[PDB]
A paper describes a structure:
FimX (PA4959) from P. aeruginosa is a 76,000 Da protein identified in mutants lacking twitching motility in response to environmental factors. FimX from P. aeruginosa contains a CheY-like response regulator domain (REC), a PAS-PAC domain commonly involved in environmental sensing, and one GGDEF and one EAL domain. EAL domains exhibit phosphodiesterase A (PDE-A) activity and are responsible for the conversion of c-di-GMP into 5′-phosphoguanylyl-(3′-5′)-guanosine (5′-pGpG). FimX-EAL displays a central barrel composed of 8 β-strands surrounded by 7 α-helices, with a αβ(β/α)6β secondary structure succession.
As a conclusion, we bring here the first high-resolution structure of an EAL domain complexed with 5′-pGpG. The 5′-pGpG was formed during crystallization by either the very weak phosphodiesterase activity of FimX-EAL or by spontaneous hydrolysis of c-di-GMP. Residual density in the active site of both EAL domains of the asymmetric unit of the P43212 crystal form leads us to place a molecule in the active site. First attempts were carried out with c-di-GMP substrate but yielded very poor fit. Instead, the accommodation of 5′-pGpG, the reaction product, in the cavity was much better and acceptable. Density is clearly defined for 5′-pGpG phosphates and sugars but not for the two guanine bases. In the complex form, two 5′-pGpG molecules are inside the cavity. The small diameters and the charges of the channels prevent 5′-pGpG molecules from escaping the cavity, trapping them inside the dimer like a bird in a cage. Interestingly, in the complexes, the 5′-pGpG conformation is very different from that of the c-di-GMP preventing clashes between the two ligands inside the dimeric catalytic pocket.
Residue numbers in the entry:
A (entry chain A): 438 to 686
B (entry chain B): 437 to 686
């Protein structure tokens, strides 16, 4: 019961609408009152056991289902936002887009329709694409990001800073948030890493981006990142992924 | 609380109370190999019994200078489990991850010899798995570590292989028997092009005398493609996901 054909389990989670959505809050250090949450996707097998994320994420690609799962995630997110601005909550969701989605001319038209249906507050959704993907497909990244702006969505680049000249890719994109890569967060006891981190963050602030620094695993890491100038932070010390959007912002 | 905490503090205490959990994911032979082979994976529960996401505690470890201590905990507990799983007809081999902090520590190798001296394991019971990026950043220490492992009758693997500028260059200077191909090569295998690249890569690994391991077998169609390509070993949830027990039927 810790095995299965993940490609078939995915084909059917889709058909029973049975993925599980999790939410990991993004914490504002500089006065953002939104309830920002990153959306994460989980999958259970028929026997109710969780399939390792790396495995079903790789399955989804092996099956050519990435884009179709993105649409399920987007529609269910749109749903939840509609149901959450129901109360006072200023919820904002960070939703991942696969490379397959990025390369797809059809995403934008499709999205415009769904958003119209839902009638959500503007700037309710942020689409997050990896640095590697934006860099592979700069032209499509450029097209997609301008498009989102017309729809009153925002964009984020994640795993930022690992490429040789990472700020170049940002030249023609419309992106408000930049989530720095996890590697920058390691061993900040070494003054040199504090400086690398600090200059990355300052360079981002200089290009007028909002920095998001992940993997805050204790209060000292949090304090260090606050001093370094981080706009937002995320990590288990604040809250790990949860099935509910119940974080006290 | 239920789903938050200071993971650095949790790690420091987990180390002291031995309350990490080891899981095992079978590495499965297509070329007969006698062994039960398992990859060792580390899990962590918070004090309230809820699982801390591995990426979060692996980062916490690096943030607190605890990576090598965690590796040593895993090694000792892996040695322990092997000696016990020997209590049966199980010719088990374990793949154990080494962090870049361990790879860099010249203290590692003599410490390893003491750990092994005490446990009386069959030779070639442990394979130490280093990522390509780590091996490539620290090639001198990887050369030294891997020659040393052979002296200790251990083996070595490079994982996420095939992503660096010239992947086969690093291999010239290391003592490594297993090569675990990066998952990037296992995508879109639907496409004949990607099948041929993978097939070629595996063939080249064979030429260079390495045993290839291909991860992310997520269905029969993927297994089917990999079979054809002559992979020495495979791994994935379609065969068996990580489990708390070494009870796969090889
Ligand atoms: Mg299938
Ligand atoms: Mg996250
Ligand atoms: Mg594994
Ligand atoms: Na945008
Ligand atoms: Na700082």
């Amino acid at each position: 019961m810790q095995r299965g054909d993940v490609i078939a389990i995915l084909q059917q989670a889709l058909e029973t609408n049975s993925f599980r959505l999790l939410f990991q809050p993004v914490i504002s250090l500089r006065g953002d009152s939104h309830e920002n949450y990153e959306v994460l996707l989980r999958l259970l097998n028929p026997q109710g056991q969780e399939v390792p994320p790396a495995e079903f994420l790789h399955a989804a690609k092996e099956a050519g289902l990435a884009e179709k799962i993105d649409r399920w995630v987007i529609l269910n997110s749109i749903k939840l936002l509609a149901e959450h601005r129901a109360k006072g909550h200023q919820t904002k969701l960070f939703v991942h887009l696969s490379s397959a989605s990025l390369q797809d001319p059809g995403l934008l038209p499709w999205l415009g329709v769904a958003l119209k249906a839902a009638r959500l507050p503007p700037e309710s959704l942020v689409f997050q694409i990896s640095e590697a993907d934006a860099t592979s497909y700069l032209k499509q990244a450029k097209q997609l990001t301008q498009g989102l702006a017309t729809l009153h969505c925002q964009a984020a680049i994640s795993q930022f800073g690992c490429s040789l000249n990472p700020f170049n890719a940002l030249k023609h994109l419309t992106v408000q948030f930049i989530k720095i890569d996890g590697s920058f967060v390691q061993d900040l006891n070494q003054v040199e890493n504090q400086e690398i981190l600090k200059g990355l963050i300052a360079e981002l602030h200089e290009q007028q981006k909002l920095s998001i620094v992940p993997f805050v695993e204790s209060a000292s890491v949090l304090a260090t990142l606050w001093q370094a100038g981080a706009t937002y932070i995320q990590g288990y010390y604040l809250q790990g992924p949860s099935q509910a959007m119940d974080y006290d912002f």
